[PDB]
Amino acid sequence: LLNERLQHYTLDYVSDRAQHMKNIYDPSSRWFSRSVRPEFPIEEFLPYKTESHEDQAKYLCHVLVNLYIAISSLDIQGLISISSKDLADLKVNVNHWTNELKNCLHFDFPVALRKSLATVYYYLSLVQGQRQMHVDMFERLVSLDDDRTNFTELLQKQGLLLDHQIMLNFLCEFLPYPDPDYARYELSSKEDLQLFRLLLKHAHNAKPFFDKSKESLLVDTMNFLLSSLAPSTMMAVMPIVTSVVPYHYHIHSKIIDYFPFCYSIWSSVSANVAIDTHMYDFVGSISKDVHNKILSSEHEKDVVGVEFGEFGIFTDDQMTFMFNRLQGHLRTDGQIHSYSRTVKPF
């Protein structure tokens, strides 16, 4: 029974210690877990022998089974506690096992189990009717830099795909509704604003895993957001645009194609924090992504359509406008919210 569940979770973990250590860093191995071996071993200098990787596999399998039992019971808030008497009369807590998984994250589990957990915690973070911990768990599962190992790239190569529509609907629930009383969320309540920011962060984390084979997702999403754009909804539209729209480069449609429209709103208004943000962020993130994919030739370079010229992916007028707005911020208005994201495009 235990062996079958270990095999299902890809936790076989052959008894040979050196062979297992070589396998966990081998991309072609079944138990591939990490790309870069730590130059300084993670406290391998302890004066005593720790537990083997076989015990870690059993503990992780037990945690996964308990987490599945807890989640499948459809009691996410954990207000109901079951004892042995409750089960006996007939004839489990999501947060507890999430904390257990957070503790166990240092066991270096294989990438397939990482994909399964990433899917589980991506779809667990969007439960309604029954939250920050789940978002943090998903973010840690897809961490960009973990001992100089990019888990997002490994999960993409494993073939991890997530549903864009559920996230888009959850984000769009904050748009105005024709009937005022039947509106779950608004943008005036502090709790609603915090939930909106949390959803934006989760969407930003889950964005790279959207299906790139759906060559119409970008166009449809951008058309919907453009048709939803209005002065009474721009404060909600712009962060959604910058957080949920994936960076897809097709022959017919590219994200760069939407650059002028943003500048249309950028040059038509005065310097303000609410509008200058979501403009530096979007363009800077896109430029950094283009640069990283160009430097990732033969492994992740499919952006041959987009060139990196004199000003990267910017025209002369766009760069001049950005520099003039930056000097206006530095000398006249000071309308800068985040400085790292402001300097990223430059």
Curated annotation (Swiss-Prot):
Cellular location(s): Nucleus; Cytoplasm
Highest taxon listed in the record's lineage: Eukaryota
The protein's role, per its UniProt record: Associated component of the proteasome that specifically recognizes acetylated histones and promotes ATP- and ubiquitin-independent degradation of core histones during DNA damage response. Recognizes and binds acetylated histones via its bromodomain-like (BRDL) region and activates the proteasome by opening the gated channel for substrate entry. Binds to the core proteasome via its C-terminus, which occupies the same binding sites as the proteasomal ATPases, opening the closed structure of the proteasome via an active gating mechanism.
Recorded domain comment: The bromodomain-like (BRDL) region specifically recognizes and binds acetylated histones. The YYX motif is required for the association with the proteasome.
Note in the entry: Present with 2600 molecules/cell in log phase SD medium.
Assembly, per entry: According to PubMed:12973301, colocalizes with nascent proteasome. According to PubMed:15778719, associates with proteasome core particles and also forms a complex with regulatory particle-core particle (RP-CP).
Family of this protein: Belongs to the BLM10 family.
Protein name: Proteasome activator BLM10
Organism (species): Saccharomyces cerevisiae (strain ATCC 204508 / S288c) (Baker's yeast)
Gene symbol of the encoding locus: BLM10
